[PDB]
Amino acid sequence: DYHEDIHTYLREMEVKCKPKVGYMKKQPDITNSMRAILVDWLVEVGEEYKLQNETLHLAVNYIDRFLSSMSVLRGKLQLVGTAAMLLASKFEEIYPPEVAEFVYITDDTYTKKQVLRMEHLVLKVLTFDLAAPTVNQFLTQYFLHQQPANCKVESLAMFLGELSLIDADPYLKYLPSVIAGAAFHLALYTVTGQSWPESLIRKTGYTLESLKPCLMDLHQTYLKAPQHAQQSIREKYKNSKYHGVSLLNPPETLNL
Amino acid sequence: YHEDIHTYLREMEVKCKPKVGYMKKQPDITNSMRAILVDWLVEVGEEYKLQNETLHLAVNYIDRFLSSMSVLRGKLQLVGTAAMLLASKFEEIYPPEVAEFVYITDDTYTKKQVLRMEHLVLKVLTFDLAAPTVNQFLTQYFLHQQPANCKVESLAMFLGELSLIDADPYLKYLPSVIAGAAFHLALYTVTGQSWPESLIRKTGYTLESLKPCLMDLHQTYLKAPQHAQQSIREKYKNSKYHGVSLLNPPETLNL
Amino acid sequence: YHEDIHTYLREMEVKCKPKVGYMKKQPDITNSMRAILVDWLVEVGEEYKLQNETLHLAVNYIDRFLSSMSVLRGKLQLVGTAAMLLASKFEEIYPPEVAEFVYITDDTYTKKQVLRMEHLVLKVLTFDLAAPTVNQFLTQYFLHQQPANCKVESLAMFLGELSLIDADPYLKYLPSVIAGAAFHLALYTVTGQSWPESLIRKTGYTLESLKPCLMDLHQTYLKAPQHAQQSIREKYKNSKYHGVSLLNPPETLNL
Amino acid sequence: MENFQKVEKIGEGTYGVVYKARNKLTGEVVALKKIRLDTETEGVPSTAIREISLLKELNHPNIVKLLDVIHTENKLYLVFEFLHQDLKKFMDASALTGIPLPLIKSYLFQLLQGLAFCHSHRVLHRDLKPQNLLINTEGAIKLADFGLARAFGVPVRTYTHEVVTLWYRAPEILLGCKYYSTAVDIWSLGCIFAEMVTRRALFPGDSEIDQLFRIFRTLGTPDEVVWPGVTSMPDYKPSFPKWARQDFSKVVPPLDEDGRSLLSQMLHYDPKRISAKAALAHPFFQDVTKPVPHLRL
Numbered sequence A: 001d002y003h004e005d006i007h008t009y010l011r012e013m014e015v016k017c018k019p020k021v022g023y024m025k026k027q028p029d030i031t032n033s034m035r036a037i038l039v040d041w042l043v044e045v046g047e048e049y050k051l052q053n054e055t056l057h058l059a060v061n062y063i064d065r066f067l068s069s070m071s072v073l074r075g076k077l078q079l080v081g082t083a084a085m086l087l088a089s090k091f092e093e094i095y096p097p098e099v100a101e102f103v104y105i106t107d108d109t110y111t112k113k114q115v116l117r118m119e120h121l122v123l124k125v126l127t128f129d130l131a132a133p134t135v136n137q138f139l140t141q142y143f144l145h146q147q148p149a150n151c152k153v154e155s156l157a158m159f160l161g162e163l164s165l166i167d168a169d170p171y172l173k174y175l176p177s178v179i180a181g182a183a184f185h186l187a188l189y190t191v192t193g194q195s196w197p198e199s200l201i202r203k204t205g206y207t208l209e210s211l212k213p214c215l216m217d218l219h220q221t222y223l224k225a226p227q228h229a230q231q232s233i234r235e236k237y238k239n240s241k242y243h244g245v246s247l248l249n250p251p252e253t254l255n256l
Numbered sequence B, C: 001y002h003e004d005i006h007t008y009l010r011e012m013e014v015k016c017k018p019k020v021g022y023m024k025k026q027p028d029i030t031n032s033m034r035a036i037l038v039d040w041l042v043e044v045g046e047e048y049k050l051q052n053e054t055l056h057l058a059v060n061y062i063d064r065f066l067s068s069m070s071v072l073r074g075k076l077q078l079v080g081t082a083a084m085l086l087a088s089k090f091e092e093i094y095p096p097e098v099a100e101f102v103y104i105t106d107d108t109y110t111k112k113q114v115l116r117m118e119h120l121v122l123k124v125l126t127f128d129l130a131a132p133t134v135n136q137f138l139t140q141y142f143l144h145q146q147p148a149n150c151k152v153e154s155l156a157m158f159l160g161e162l163s164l165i166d167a168d169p170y171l172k173y174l175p176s177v178i179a180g181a182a183f184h185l186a187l188y189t190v191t192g193q194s195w196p197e198s199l200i201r202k203t204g205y206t207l208e209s210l211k212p213c214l215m216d217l218h219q220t221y222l223k224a225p226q227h228a229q230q231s232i233r234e235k236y237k238n239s240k241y242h243g244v245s246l247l248n249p250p251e252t253l254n255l
Numbered sequence D: 001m002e003n004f005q006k007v008e009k010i011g012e013g014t015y016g017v018v019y020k021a022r023n024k025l026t027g028e029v030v031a032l033k034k035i036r037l038d039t040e041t042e043g044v045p046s047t048a049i050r051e052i053s054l055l056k057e058l059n060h061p062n063i064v065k066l067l068d069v070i071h072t073e074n075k076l077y078l079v080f081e082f083l084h085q086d087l088k089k090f091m092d093a094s095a096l097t098g099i100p101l102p103l104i105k106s107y108l109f110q111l112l113q114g115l116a117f118c119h120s121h122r123v124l125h126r127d128l129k130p131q132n133l134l135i136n137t138e139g140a141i142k143l144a145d146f147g148l149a150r151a152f153g154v155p156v157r158t159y160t161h162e163v164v165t166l167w168y169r170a171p172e173i174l175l176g177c178k179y180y181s182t183a184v185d186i187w188s189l190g191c192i193f194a195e196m197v198t199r200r201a202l203f204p205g206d207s208e209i210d211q212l213f214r215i216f217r218t219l220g221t222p223d224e225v226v227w228p229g230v231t232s233m234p235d236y237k238p239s240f241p242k243w244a245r246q247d248f249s250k251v252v253p254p255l256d257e258d259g260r261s262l263l264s265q266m267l268h269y270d271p272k273r274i275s276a277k278a279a280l281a282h283p284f285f286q287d288v289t290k291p292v293p294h295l296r297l
Ligand SMILES: CN1CCN(c2cccc3nc(-c4n[nH]c5cc(-c6ccc(N)cc6)ccc45)[nH]c23)CC1
Pocket: D010, D011, D018, D031, D033, D051, D055, D064, D080, D081, D082, D083, D084, D085, D086, D131, D134, D143, D144, D145, D146, D147
C-alpha cells in the first residue's frame, strides 16, 4: 500500500540530499584518509554506545554535506563528526546518549560548549534537513523482496553497505539506492548464489547492467577489506549478532 | 410557436445589425466614450428600476444611430438619453416621464432637446424599435435548462451585459452568438457543464462555432475587475443576482 | 559576449520565476490591488525620473516576495516601497534617499518601517537582486533592428510595461517571451514587419511559439484605454516616447 | 524576532510556550512556539529537531505549516500558520448538541488526507489526539504537534516510556509490540471519529490493563483467528478474560451502515487495519462537503 509511495519518495529525496562529489579536492587541510579515520571511529562509538546502524549512516551523510560547503581544519574534523553523531542520535535513537557522553569519547579534546556550538552550526549549515535517505533505508526496503528471508544475506548486505561509508572515493558518486542495490546483489550472490531479483528490478527499475559500475567497486572493496587500514566494521561484523559475515570469503569473480 | 419565434428572431437579428466599423468613421467620439455612456445607462436603469431588456434595446438604438450619424462628444449623452426614453416606452409597463430623463442628465440638456432627439432617432431608425437582443436569446435558451439554475441565469445575464460595454469586439457578433457564449460560460463556471445538445439542435451552433466569441467573452470576464467601467459588476453583486459578479472565473475553458 | 550574455540571461530568467498561482494562496490581497500598486510605482518613477529597468526590477522583487509571504492589504504598499528603494539602489546611479520614499507614501509608513521592510525583502530574496527583466531582453533584441526605429522601440517598451500591470496572464510567461511578443507587435504596428529571422536564430523562438503570449499582449493593447490603471498610457503619450500610447493598435495580427 | 509582536499566550508545553503573534511588517498572524535553550546541558531538544526536520517536508493543506525557524543565541522559535482552536475544546463546546454529522465526515476526510500525506512521506505522527488537531472558521482541520513524530524508512522502535496518551493508544502497543506501524495513527483517528459521533471517549482507560480491557469489552478479546500472533505477544496473558464483540449499532448508534463499516475497519485488531488512502475511497465519503463550524470564540 504505502511501501511503494515511500520508496518513490525516498528516491526523490536522495537526489536532493546529495553532497558535492568532489568536495575533498576543494578542501585545503583534510583528506579522504582523514575522513576514513573519522568514520571508522564513529563505528566504534556506535558499538560502544549500542547505537542503531541508521544513526551511523545519517551522521556520515551530515558530515559529507557539511564538508561540501565548509572548510575545516584537521584538528576540528572530529568536532564535526561528534556533533553529527549527536544530531543523528537525537533524530534516530529512542533515547540518545547525553552530551557529556559525546564529550567523553573525544578524550576531552573538545569542550561541552564547543560540541553544543558545533551542533548549532551544523543545524544552520544543513538548514535542519536531517531526514536524509541512506543505504540502510533502501536495504531495509529491498529486504522485503526476499523469497524467502535470509539473515546471513541481510547481515552481509549491511556489512558491505557499511564499508561503502569509509571511502569517499569512489562511493560519494553513487546514490544510496544504487549502493544498496549492489550490496544486496553481492551479499545475495555470496551467500545463496542467486542474483538481483526480478521483483526488485520492477520496483527499483535498476537492472544488473545498471548496477555493474557500483558492483565492480563494491566487489573490489569487499576483496580488499582485510587489508584496509580501517578495521572497525570488519571487527563489528564478525560478531554473532551479524552471523560472523565479515569472515565469509568473497567470490574472486562476479560472472557478469 | 417558441420555434417560430426563435426562427423569426434569428431572421431579424441579421437585419438590425449596425455597421461594425462605424466608430472609425466617427470624428469626435471613441469606444471609450461609448463605454462611459453605456455604463452610465446601467446606473440610470438601477436608479429607475428598469428592465434589463430596456438597457439592451437602448444600446442597440445608439449603435444604429451612430452608424449613420456623426455626433459630437457633447451630444453623445443626449443620444443615449433619447434612446433610453424610447426603449422605456417600448418595453416598460410604465416608463419614467420625460422630466425624469432630463434630471438624470444633471440639466446638461433641456426637455425640448430630449424630445427633439427622440423624434430624430425615430426618423433615423425608421420606427424599427423591436430589435432582437442578447437578453431575448438568453431568455429563450434558459427554457432548455435541465433543470433551472438561477445562479447560472444570473451569471449568463451578467456576462451578456458586460458585452454591451465594449464595441470592440462585441459589435461583430450576433446577439444569438453572444447569448450562446454567455450561457455556456456561465453554465461551465457554476455547474461545470457545457453547451447542451438540446440547444445545439435548436440553434445549430456548436461549441466549435461559439469558440471565437467564447474566447473574447472569457477574456472580458477575467478582466472585469480591472475595467474602468464598473456599474455592471456593482449591479450584479446584489442579492437579486446572487452576487454572481464576485464569483471567480474559470482559468481555462478546456476547449 | 553579447551571445554569452543572452545565453546567461536565458538561464537566469528560469531561476528567478515567482510562483504563477501565488495570488490564490494569498488571503487578503488580489490581482486588482497588485495592479493598483504597480500603476502607482510607475507614477513614482515618473515623479523621481527613475529608469524603466528600476520599475521592472521592483515588480520582480514584489512578485517573488509575495510568492512566499502573506501580506495584508495595508502592508502591500510598504512591500512595494521597499522593493522600489532596493531596485533604485541596484540600478540607479544615485537613488532617491530613503526620506524620499517615505514621502511618496504620504506618511502612511515610517522611515523605520521602510528600512525594516528593506531588510526583510533582502532576507526573503536572499540578496538575489540581479533578476532578468523584459526590459533587458528588449534592449538585447533592439540590436537586431535593420535599421533602428525609435517609434518601434518606444512602443515595444510601452507594451512590455503594460505586461507588468496584470499578473493574470503575464506571470506565466518568461520575460524573454513577453519581450519577443512586445517587439513583434510594436514592429508590426509601426512598420508592418514581423519578428525577424535574425532574432529567430538568436532566441530560437518562432512566431508560432510567441503566439499565445502575442494574443494576450494584443488583447491588452486593444483594451489599454479602458483599463482602470492609466499611468503607463499617460507616461507614453510624452514626446520622449513619441506619443506611442496614442497609436492605434492593429485590428488583426494575421497569424 | 524584532518584527514579531507578541499578542498573547495560547499554549503551554514542556520545552516552551506558544504565543499568538503578528508580523508587524506584513500583518501576518502567526503562532510562535518558543524554545528556551539550555546551552550548558542539552542543546536543541530532540522534539524540535524531529518536528522541524519532518514538518518542513510536509506541505499539505491539512498539516499545519511551519513558516520559519528563527534560530539564534539562546532561543529557538518555530513560526507556524495560526489556527483558531483545537478539536478538544470544540468537542466540549458542542456537548449539548454534538458536532453535526456532515462536519464530522468533513473533519475525518481532511484528517485522513493529512495522514495519508504523512505516511506517503514515511512520517509517523504517533500522537493523534483531539488537542493536537487544529481547526479554523472556514471549516479546515489540520494535524499539529509533530514532536513525537518519526521517520520510518527504517522501522520505528517502541518505547517503554513516552507516548500517545492512553485513550488513543493502539492494542499492539499495549500488548508490547516491538515496532510501530502506520496502523497506530489510523487507530487513534478511529477513536477520535467515534468520540465526535458519540460525544464520549471510546476507550477511557485508567491504566494500561484497564485500557486493554475496555477495548476487549467493546471489540471482543482477540484470538489467533482474529489476529494471528496475539497470544505470542510480550504483554499477552492467557488469563485475559474472553469478552464477546458487541454490535457497532450500540457502540456508535448515530452512525449509518457505511460509517459503522469504516470505523470497524479503522479499529481492526490486526495492524489488516485500513490504510488512510484506502479509507479515503470508502463509500462513507461519497457525499462529503465542507461545512463551517460554530466556533464559540
Ligand atoms: C492545547 N491547545 C492547543 C490549541 N490552543 C489554541 C487555542 C486558540 C488558538 C490557537 N491557535 C493555535 C495554533 N495555531 N497554530 C499552531 C501550531 C502549533 C504547532 C505546534 C507544534 C507543531 N509541531 C505543529 C504545530 C500549535 C498550536 C497552534 N493553537 C491555539 C489552545 C491550547
